[PDB]
Design a protein around this nucleic acid. Sequence first.
RNA 1: GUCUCGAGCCCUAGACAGCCGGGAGGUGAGCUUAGAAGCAGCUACCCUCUAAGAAAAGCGUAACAGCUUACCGGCCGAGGU
Lengths: 70, 29, 172
Amino acid sequence: GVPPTAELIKDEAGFETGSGEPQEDFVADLSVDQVKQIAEQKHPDLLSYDLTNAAKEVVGTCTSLGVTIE
Amino acid sequence: IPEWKQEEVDAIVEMIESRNTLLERALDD
Amino acid sequence: PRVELEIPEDVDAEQDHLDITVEGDNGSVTRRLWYPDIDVSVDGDTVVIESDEDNAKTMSTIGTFQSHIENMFHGVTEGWEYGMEVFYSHFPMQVNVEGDEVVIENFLGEKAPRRTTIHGDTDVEIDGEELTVSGPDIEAVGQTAADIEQLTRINDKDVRVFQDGVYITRKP
RNA sequence: GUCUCGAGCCCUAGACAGCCGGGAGGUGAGCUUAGAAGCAGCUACCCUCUAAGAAAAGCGUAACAGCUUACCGGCCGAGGU
Ligand SMILES: [Mg+2]
């Protein structure tokens, strides 16, 4: 039921299109608290037991786009 | 004796306290 | 080298000279297993294939003799069976078992019937568009099935377009 | 084709082959695009579950789907490469 991960990032980022080269061309940005919220949403989608690992999963598409974290 | 096999036997013996051959190995311990 | 084959309880295996006869509930099969310095004997309840020579050539045949004997065991008990399907596009092919040979009529529209003789005590059972070749001797069954498929061999035209024929569908 | 001799690596903590089962999630990665979801192209190629399982090696689809490869487990059992 819950929409794809790539989209949930583009909302709180303010950017739509990614980059011609991931990590080499930083586009969007995030923060720890921002990622903590997206981790609360997906439960059946993710296989992780802890919320710690739930964040790790979300933070897999991020950096490979240009989503730097602070 | 490959290192990954010795290191695996350990991880198995660890979960017992708290490949079928590696399980039997951990049991014998 | 020496390899011992324990004969199944359903089976009986007598042997004279270079010939080996294997009898079972499904029938009997006799074969000649002749090769330099390879002795094949029946020691009570086991068949023994042995030789003093261990060279590549000898070992090759020893392995062949083993598989041959094991197949006879299977044949006289469980039996050998090949399944076939008759396919045709424009011309309805009339496959029939006339006497001791399978006959194919009107193949690809031909006026003259194509036929092949069935090997040994091999039985060919036909059920509409399906055929089932069976028997105790895998040698006879294997060939009989093959013969049937080969019977519709076509060399003059593009097989990709002219696909009519009986084909081996299931192998044991 | 076959005979002989040497060297390296693997192997009963189960090798080589074969057969069976698994080959999973975030997600059909992002860019490109009407679309492209392992596999037209460009960049990247990151982390969960776990005993394994690639941001996919090979076919396959208009794209999907579909079939196997990697990798893991089992059966087998002795040498193998
Ligand atoms: Mg021509």
